[model samples]
Target chain A: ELAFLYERDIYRLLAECDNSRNPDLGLIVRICLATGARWSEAETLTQSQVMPYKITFTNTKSKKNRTVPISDELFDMLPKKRGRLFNDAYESFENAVLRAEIELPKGQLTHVLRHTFASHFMMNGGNILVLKEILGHSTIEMTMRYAHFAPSHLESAVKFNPLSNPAQ
Target chain B: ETELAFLYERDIYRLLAECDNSRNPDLGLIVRICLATGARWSEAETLTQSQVMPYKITFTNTKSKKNRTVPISDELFDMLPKKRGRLFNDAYESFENAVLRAEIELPKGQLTHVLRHTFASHFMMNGGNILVLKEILGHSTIEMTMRYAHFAPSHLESAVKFNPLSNPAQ
Candidate 1:
C-alpha cells in the first residue's frame, strides 16, 4: 500500500474494493497487459481457460484458439469452473463501460480495448507472426495492421520515402 | 468506372452458361448472389425468397444462425434474375469448376466462399467498420471482424501509436 504515488488511491475505495470484492477488471486488465489477448478472447475465459500461470481459449473471430499467461493476482479473481470469466451477459460489459467516468476518444467505442491490445503488443516488441496466431488471423496482412502502431514502425514506414532514401 | 469495368468483365449470363449442367437458372442466381454479396456459398444455396428483399438480403441462419443483412448494391441487384427453382446446392459442381479456372491454386471450398472472403477483405481494406462488416458477413463477434481488420494497416498503426502506453515509452 505504501508504494510511491499509489499510497493515496491505493488505500481508498478503489483498491480496497478491488482486493476484497470479486473484480473482473484486474483479470481483464492483466489479459490486456500481459498476453495482449483481444476482448473476445478475454471474454471466452472460464476458470478452465486459466492454466497454472496462463489462460487459453478459442478465439471466436478467426475460429482459432490461443493460450496466454496470467499473473497470480489477476488469476485469483476468476470464478473456478464457473460459466464466464466475469459477467455472463454481454450487456453487463456495455453497461459497465457506459457507467465508467473514463472519457474515451471522440467517436471511439469500448471495443477499442481489442485495438489497445494489438497496439500495446506491437509497441512493446511483440511479433506480428505470434500476434496472428494469438489473435487468430488467417493471414499476415491481417496482423500487419498493428505494425504501424509501433513508434519505430513510423520511421520504418517512411524509410521507403523516395526523397529521404533510395535503393542503389 | 464501376459499370464500365463490370461490362468489360465476364458477363453473368456467360458465366451461368458455363454451368449449363444445372437445369434451373436460379442456381446461377444463387452463385451470382454469393459472388456479389460475399455471402457464404452455403448461405446462397439455402436461401429463401423470404430472406431477400427488393433492396437487401438477409442471412437468417449464418455461421451460427446469426441474423444479418447486406444492402444489395446496384451491380449485384441487377445480376439477380427473377426466377423460381432449386435455390440451394444446385449446380454447385459446375460453379466450382468454373471458379477453378480463375484460381492458380487449390481453393479447398466452393467458389462462393472465395467471393465472401474477397468481399470481406475488400470491404475492410476500403474502410468498412467491424460492426457493419460483421453484420454484412453475419459474424457474431468483432474478433471475427478483427480477423479482417489487418487490411487497413495505417488505421492499425495509428491506433497502436495512440495507445496509452506510447506516452510513457516516449
Candidate 2:
C-alpha cells in the first residue's frame, strides 16, 4: 500500500502513457486508478461490460463478478472494443513508469495505480467494507492491511488506553 | 507464510490404523477423501454425490469460491457412501477423537488440515508438477503451492550424493 504513485506522478505517467505502443494504455491506467481494478481486469474488459456510468468485471481473479462505477471522462475515453479492450500493456506500463521517474519496487511497476487508488481512498476516508467489495477480496483481513492509511484507524488506542484514562 | 507441517511415513501409518477404529464409519471415509484429493476438512465431508463422478471429484463452493476437479482412482470413486444428495454426516468431533486415539500430536489448529498437508506433501515428494498441483489444490497463486516445494525429494538426497565426504577423490 505504501508503494504508490502520488497525484503529480500520476500526471507524469498519464503524459508518458499517451505515447505507448499499446493504444489503450491511458484508459487502462485510468480504470485501475479510478476503481482499484487489477491490470488483467481492466485490460481484458470487453465492449459489452462497460456501461455509461459503471463497469462490470467478469471472470476476475476471484472468479466472481464485480461492478463499480466510472467517471464520465473515463467512460468516454475507453476505446471501442472487438474482444478485449486493451492490448497487452505490461511493457507499455514499464516504459511509461520508467519515463515518469516514479520510483517503484523491483518488478512492481504494474500495480502502482492500484496501490495509489486504495491508498488515496483510505486517506480520504473511504470505508473498509466498501474498499473490500471494490477489491473483490474474500475476507476482511486482506483489506485490513490498508486500514493503516486511515487517519483515525489506530486513534482509539491512543484515546482509550489505560495509561491515557486510568481507573477512577 | 508459516512452514506447514506434514506427517512422516510411520506417523501416517499410525494415523491410518486409528481411522477405522472410530464408531463413525464416515470418519475414516472423510479423512480418506482429504488425503486423496487434498480437500479441506469440510469440503471432503460435504461432498455431494454429483460432485463424485466416475473418475474425478469436483469440489464446489470452495474456500476460494471456485470449483476445482481433481482426478480420483476408480477404487476411490467406488468407495464413497451415498446419500441421495450429500454423501456423509459431519464427522469433525469424531475425527478429533480418532486423532487422540492414534496418539499422534498435530500442530495446534491443524487437526484436520494435517490430512491436506499429508496429501499435498506426498504429491510434491512424488515429483508432482507445481502448476498442476496448484490447479488440483484450487489455489489462486503458485506462491500458495510454493510452501510444499521444500518437501521435494532432491535436496536431502542431492546432499548425500554430492557431499565431499562421499567423494572417492576427496
Candidate 3:
C-alpha cells in the first residue's frame, strides 16, 4: 500500500502549484522526486550542496549523511539562494495534491513524491544495494521494501545469490 | 614475495611426507586439506563432523563470518578422524614446527598464510578461473582474488607473445 504520484497527477500537481508564487511548491517537489529526500529534508536544505553535482543530505531520519549525484540538467538549472534555498512549501504541496485530482492516504500527503523517486529508481536498472546507500537506509531489509515496488524486482536477486549457476 | 610454484609444485610430496613425521599427524591431514581446498588454516581447524556432507565440506566461522561449502577429495574425507566436537587440536605451533621440519622457507608471519597463496597461485596458474577460486576461497571482493591473476595461464603465455617489446616480428 505504499504510494507515489502518477505521471498525470505529477504533471497536474506541477500545474496546480502555478509556479508564480514566492514559495515555489513544484520546485521543492522536483527535488524530492530527484533525490528521494523526505519532505522535511528537501525543504530544509542549508544550501551547501551546490558546489559539486551531488547533494549531501545531512541530519537525516537515519542519522547518516548520504551524498547522491544530481542529474547534470537538474544541477545547472537549480534555483540557487544564499541559504535556506526553499521556503516552507508543505501548505502548497497539500494544495497541489488536492488539485491534481489524486486522493492519497492520510500519511502519504507529500511523501508520495519521495515514493515516486524510489519506485521509479528501482524500475529503471537501479541496484537494490546501491539504492540502499543512496536512500541512507540502514540495512538491506529496508531496501527489500523499496525494491518490492517492481514486478520483476528479483533481477538483483539471482545475480548476487551465492549458489548461482554457471560457476558462481 | 611469492615462492616459485615449482618449489612445491602440484606434486609436493616432501612436505606431505614430512608433515606425517611431525608430532601431530592431524596437522598433516589439515595441511593437505588446506592446500587442496585453498582453505584458511583456522577454517579447517574448527570443523565439526556434521559440517562434512556427502561430498561437500562446509567450512564455517570463516574470517569473513561467511560459511563456504567446498567439495573435498574422498581421500582426505576418509582420512579425517571421527572427532567428538572440534576436529583438530590447536595446530598453529604444530604447523610452524612442521614447516620447520619440512624446511619450507616462509617469511615472518607468512607460514600459514603462505599456504593460501601457494594453493591459489597454482590453481590460477593451472588455468582455473578467478571467480571460481573466489567462491572456493570465500573471498568477498574480486580484488583480493585478483592478487593471484598474474599467475594465470595467459599471464605468461599471451602477454609474452602480445607485448611489442618481445620482438616477435624481429
Q: lDDT for each of the candidates? A: 0.50, 0.68, 0.63
All candidates in order of TM-score, best leading = 3, 2, 1
Q: Using DockQ as the measure, which candidate wins?
A: 1
lDDT of 3 by residue, A1-168 (tens): 777755556667768876536455766776777777788887877778555567778875446687766655656666776787878888878766776677888898757776776666655434444556666777555656765443342122122211121111
Best by TM-score: 3
Q: How well is each residue in B1-170 modelled by candidate 2, as lDDT tens digits?
A: 26577766666656667878888888877876777777888898988888877767888783567888777666666788766688998889998887888787777787857878777777766544444566677887656876776654432222112211121111
Model 1: per-residue lDDT, tens digit, A26-73?
345445434545555675677666776566767464556666544455
Give the chain A TM-score for each candidate.
0.60, 0.84, 0.83
Error of 3 at A138 (Å): 1.0
Better of 1 and 2 by lDDT: 2
lDDT of 3 at A113: 73
Residue B53 lDDT (model 2): 76
On TM-score, the stronger of 1 and 3 is 3
Residue A131 lDDT, candidate 1, scale 0-100? 58
Clash pairs for candidate 2: none
Model 1 ranges with Cα > 4 A deviation: A1-168, B1-24, B62-65, B83-89, B107-112, B156-170
Q: What DockQ do the predictions score, one after another?
A: 0.03, 0.01, 0.01
Worst 10 residues of 2 chain A by lDDT: A159-168
